[PDB]
């Protein structure tokens, strides 16, 4: 068949009931995730191919970057709570992996200030239990599929994208094969 288990995707042996339809996991410390966001715009291109009524969820992980990696999961919870993912994703990637200007939780906070989130508003969110709950949701979802690597993407808690079974001689063709696979899986 054109799409085959083990080629463009793998099937979870333990399916996760009631999981988000399209669930992406990343880390601001992960070099491939930097490419997935800034060079390939994977999330945007998947979203532009997805059927109607299919929601996309994207979560940060703790297992890279020790203390700061856990700060970044909480900061991503702040980004989701305030709805400013599109404003902070690039400066967070570049601050961690390009310019090496993110070394502390305060440096993370500076990205949000510079992106226009008020200081009192960032701090209220950071300390809020709504943000604690969002952190817990990110952890639970990763635990549900015993996640040990990023980037990763899961469709209906059943299928996991397999990018290494795709051709990368052309970056645009790769992106569209990846997105078409997500669409194919969402339609299973
Ligand atoms: C075109 C392209 C394709 C890639 O394919 C992969 C390979 C492995 C993983 C998971 C992991 O091992 O971290 C994720 C995507 C990666 C980077 C770029 C760029 N520019």
In Å, what resolution does this model reach? 2.0
DSSP 3-state helix, strand, coil percentages of the chain (rounded to 5)? 55, 10, 35
Which technique was used to obtain these atomic coordinates? Answer: X-ray
Nearest partner of 28 among 57, 70, 56, 82, judged by Cα: 70
Atom index in ligand 1 nearest the CA of residue 152 equals: 10
Tell me if 162 sits within 8 A of 9, measured CB to CB.
yes
What is the rounded CA–CA span in Å between residue 77 and residue 60? 8
CATH number for the domain that contains residue 117: 3.40.30.10
**Number of domains comprising the chain:** 1
At 74, list the tokens: 């909480």
Nearest residue (CA) to ligand 1, atom 2: 168
| Sheet with strand 159-161: strands edge to edge | 9-11, 159-161, 152-155, 22-26, 56-60
Cβ(32) – ligand 1 distance below 6 Å? yes
Among 81, 22, 20, 76, which residue's Cα sits nearest to residue 47? Answer: 22
Question: Closest ligand 1 atom, CA of 171?
Answer: 1
Task: Identify the domain containing residue 97 by its residue range.
Answer: 1-188
Q: How far apart are CA 140 and CA 18, in angstroms?
A: 13
Q: Parallel, antiparallel, or unpaired for β 56-60 and 22-26?
A: parallel
List C-alpha distances in Å: 43 to 14, 23, 103, 109: 25, 10, 26, 24
Q: For tokens 């997500």, what's the residue?
A: 182
Q: How many helices (H) and strands (E) does the chain have?
A: 8, 5
Residue nearest to atom 3 of ligand 1 (CA): 168
């Amino acid at each position: 068949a054109q799409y085959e288990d083990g080629k463009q995707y793998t099937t979870l042996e333990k399916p996760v009931a009631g999981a988000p339809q399209v669930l992406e996991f990343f880390s601001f410390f992960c070099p491939h995730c930097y490419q997935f966001e800034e060079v390939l715009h994977i999330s945007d291109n998947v979203k532009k191919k997805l059927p109607e009524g299919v929601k996309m969820t994207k979560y940060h992980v703790n297992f890279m970057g020790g203390d700061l990696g856990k700060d970044l999961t909480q900061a991503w919870a702040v980004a989701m709570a305030l709805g400013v993912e599109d404003k902070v994703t690039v400066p967070l990637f570049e601050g961690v992996q390009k310019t090496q200007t993110i070394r502390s939780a305060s440096d993370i906070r500076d990205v949000f200030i510079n992106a226009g989130i008020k200081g009192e508003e960032y701090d209220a969110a950071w300390n809020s239990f709504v943000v604690k709950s969002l952190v817990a949701q990110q952890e639970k979802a990763a635990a549900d599929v015993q996640l040990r690597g990023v980037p990763a993407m899961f469709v209906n808690g059943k299928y996991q994208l397999n990018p290494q079974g795709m051709d990368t001689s052309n970056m645009d063709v790769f992106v569209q094969q990846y997105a078409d696979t997500v669409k194919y899986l969402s339609e299973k």
